[PDB]
Design a binder for this molecule. Structure first.
Ligand SMILES: O=C(c1ccccc1Nc1cccc(C(F)(F)F)c1)N(O)CC[C@@H](c1ccc(Cl)c(Cl)c1)P(=O)(O)O
Lengths: 365, 379
C-alpha cells in the first residue's frame, strides 16, 4: 500500500519540499501528477525527468493538460489517494472542489481556497478529508489529540510577528517592500493578514468560535500553535521551522514519517519568547474575526481585498499601513456580502466586488 | 458516571488537594475511603467529619490507645482498607515504605491507581509493574503527568525521546569547585521532622531528577537512553515528547498540583477548572539549557542503576537517603552524596536479581543503608 499523490504548485517551495519527502519515502508515497503556474518552466521539466511523471498540467500556454483550468482537469481525471494543493491564491479554488469531489484526502496548503470558499468548501468535504499543510494547523491537530472537543477552552495560534514588532503606525508609513520581506505569504506575515487568514481557517476546520481563538506573538517560530484545555493544561507543538514536517504529516495522516525534519535540540541553550500582539498597530486579526463572524462571502471579501491592496503596495501605489486600512474600508462597505454562497459564481462575484472596491480606495490613497 | 475514590495519605498536601478537587466536583467523584498514619489521627478525624466518610483507616500501629472506634488500624491497615473497599480509583499519597503494599493491593483490585508514592516505582518497581495492567497506573507528579499527556501525540513506535524538564535547583550554574563546601542551608534545607529537608536536598543534588528518570522508564516502558533531562528554570513546561518525524509535544501550565491530581483521578477525562491556564496576555520567556552532567552525575547514575534492573534502584534510593541525611547532619561534604551512591552501587551486584516479594525489596534497602552507613562512617 503506497499512497498516490497529485502535487499542485509543484515548482514552488511547498511543492518542491513535498517531492523531496516523497522521494525519501518511496515505500509510503508515489507521485502520480504535477501542476505548475508556468513561471518556473525549467523546474517542471526537471521534475518530469527526475520522477518520470508525464501526467502534467500547465496553467500558461508534451503537456496533456494545458489551459487556464489545467490543474482542475488533471485532478478530475487522475486516480489518486491524496491531492496536495500548493497552488497560490485564487487559481486554487476550483482544484480544491475538484479534489474533494474525487473523495481523495486534500492536503491543503492553499488556505485561500478555504477562506474564500467557506461553507461551499465544507459541504463538499467529508469529515477528516481536509488535512491542513500549514505549520499552525498541523500543530493544532497534533495538540487536539490531547483531549475531546468539549475539553477545549482556547486554540492559541502563534504568530512570528513579522519584521515590524515594536513599530508604530507612523514608523510603518515609510516601509518599503524589501523591509517587509518582498520585492517590487511573506508580505501577509509582515502585515498579520496571514494570521487573520489562519484564524478564519481555524474556525472553519475545527468548528471553534472566534472568541476562543487567540493569537500570541512568538518570534522564534518554534512553537507552531497550542491548545489550552478546560482544566488549565496547555499542549504545544514545537520544531525548528521546516515545512517538510507538516507536509509529511499531511500526506501520511494519521501516521508520522520518520526523519521528516530535525527535532528541537536541547543540548544548546535557547529561549522561546511570548508577547501580546499590538492590536492597535496590527488589526488584521480583529478584522478577520469580524469577517468570520459576519460569515458567508465576507471571508472571500477579506481575502480578495487583501490581494488587491497588497498588489498595490508591491507596485508602490500605496503605503504599507494602507494594506490593512483598505481591507478595513472594503469590509465596512460589504453589507451585501454576509450571504451564504450557493455556487462558485457567488464566491467569484464576492471577490470581483472586493477587488474593484479596493482599486477604488487605492485611487484615493 | 460517579467515580469512587479511595484517598491514601489523605492528610498531607496531595491528599488535602485531591479532596478539594473532589469537593468541587461531586458529580464526578465520590470519596469512599481515607487513610493516614497515626501521627495524623486528629486531622484524619476532621476529614471524616467534613466528608462524612466513616470508612477510614489508621495506616500504621501508632496512636493505638486513641483508635478506639476506627474500622482499620495497625500495620498494613491501609492495604486492608484497599482490599475491602469497592472503588474505581485509588489515590496513593502515602510516603515511603508504607506506600508499597497498598499499591500492590490496589492494582490487584483492578482499580485505577493514581500514584504519588515514589517508593512504589523506585524501590518496588518490578513488583508493581508485574501486578499492573497496561494503563492501570496514572502518575500524579507534574512531569510524568506532562509525559502522559504528550504521548497522546502518537503511537508507541513513533516515540523518539522523552524529555523531562528540571528547574536545575539552587545550584544551577555552579562549578564543581564551588560546590565542595556548600552547607545544607545553602541547598535550602532546614531542620524539620518530615521528608521536606530530604526532598529539598534531592532537588539540589539532582537525585530527584534521577528518580524521575527511573520512574519514567517504569511508567512508560521507554529505554533509559531515550530519556533525556533538560534544564528549564521557569518550570512552566513540565515535560515533552519528541516523535520520529521531528515533532515535539510539550505540556505547559503554571505550577499547581491540582492540575495533575485532577487528571490522575479523572483519567482519561479532564476536570474543568482544576487550575489556572498559562496567560499569554503578558510577555514571558521559556528558556532551556543543557544539564551539566560532569557536575551533576546523579542523573546518569540513576540510569546506570535502572539498566542494571531488579532491586538496583531500591539500592540507589536507599543509599541516597543515608548519604543525604549525613550531609544534612554536617557529617559529609555535598559532593560525597553521589560519590557514596556510586560506591554502594559498585558493590551491589547481588541486587540486580528481580525481587520475588516485598521482603526482597526490604532486604535490598537494608543492605544499601548499612553499606552507606559504613561509607559515611569512614570520612
Ligand atoms: O507554516 C507556516 C510557516 C511557519 C514558519 C516558517 C515558515 C512557514 N511557512 C512559510 C513561510 C514563508 C514562505 C512559505 C512558502 F513559500 F509558501 F513556502 C512558507 N506558516 O503558515 C507561515 C506563517 C508564519 C510565518 C512565520 C515565519 C516566517 Cl519567516 C514567515 Cl514569512 C511566516 P506567521 O503568520 O508570521 O506566524
Amino acid at each position: 500500500g503506497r499512497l498516490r499523490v497529485v502535487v499542485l504548485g509543484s515548482t514552488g517551495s511547498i511543492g518542491t519540499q513535498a517531492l523531496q519527502v516523497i522521494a525519501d519515502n518511496p515505500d509510503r508515497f508515489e507521485v502520480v501528477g504535477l501542476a505548475a503556474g508556468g513561471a518556473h518552466l525549467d523546474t517542471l521539466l526537471r521534475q518530469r525527468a527526475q520522477t518520470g511523471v508525464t501526467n502534467i498540467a500547465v496553467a500558461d500556454e508534451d503537456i496533456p493538460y494545458h489551459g487556464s483550468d489545467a490543474a482542475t482537469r488533471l485532478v478530475e481525471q487522475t486516480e489518486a489517494d491524496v491531492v496536495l494543493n500548493a497552488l497560490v491564491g485564487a487559481l486554487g479554488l476550483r482544484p480544491t472542489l475538484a479534489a474533494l469531489k474525487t473523495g481523495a484526502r486534500l492536503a491543503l496548503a492553499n488556505k485561500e481556497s478555504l477562506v474564500a470558499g467557506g461553507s461551499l468548501v465544507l459541504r463538499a468535504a467529508r469529515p477528516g478529508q481536509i488535512v491542513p499543510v500549514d505549520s499552525e494547523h498541523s500543530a493544532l491537530a497534533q495538540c487536539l489529540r490531547g483531549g475531546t472537543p468539549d475539553e477545549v477552552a482556547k486554540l492559541v495560534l502563534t504568530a512570528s510577528g513579522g519584521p515590524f514588532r515594536g513599530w508604530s503606525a507612523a514608523d510603518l508609513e515609510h516601509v518599503t517592500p524589501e523591509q517587509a520581506g518582498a520585492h517590487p505569504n511573506t508580505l501577509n506575515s509582515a502585515s498579520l493578514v496571514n494570521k487573520g487568514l489562519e484564524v478564519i481557517e481555524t474556525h472553519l476546520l475545527f468548528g471553534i468560535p472566534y472568541d476562543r481563538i487567540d493569537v500570541v506573538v512568538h518570534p522564534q517560530s518554534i512553537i507552531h500553535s497550542m491548545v489550552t484545555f478546560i482544566d488549565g493544561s496547555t499542549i504545544a507543538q514545537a520544531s525548528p521551522p521546516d515545512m517538510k514536517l507538516p507536509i509529511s504529516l499531511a500526506l501520511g495522516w494519521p501516521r508520522r514519517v520518520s526523519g521528516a525534519a530535525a527535532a528541537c535540540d536541547f543540548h544548546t541553550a535557547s529561549s522561546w519568547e511570548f508577547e501580546p500582539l499590538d492590536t492597535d498597530v496590527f488589526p488584521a486579526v480583529e478584522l478577520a474575526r469580524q469577517a468570520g463572524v459576519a460569515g458567508g462571502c465576507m471571508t472571500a471579501v477579506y481575502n480578495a481585498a487583501n490581494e488587491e491592496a497588497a498588489a498595490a503596495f508591491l507596485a508602490g501605489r500605496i503605503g504599507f499601513p494602507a494594506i490593512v486600512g483598505i481591507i478595513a474600508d472594503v469590509l465596512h462597505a460589504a453589507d451585501q456580502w454576509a450571504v451564504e454562497p450557493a455556487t462558485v459564481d457567488d464566491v467569484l462575484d464576492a471577490q470581483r466586488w472586493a477587488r474593484e472596491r479596493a482599486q477604488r480606495a487605492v485611487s484615493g490613497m
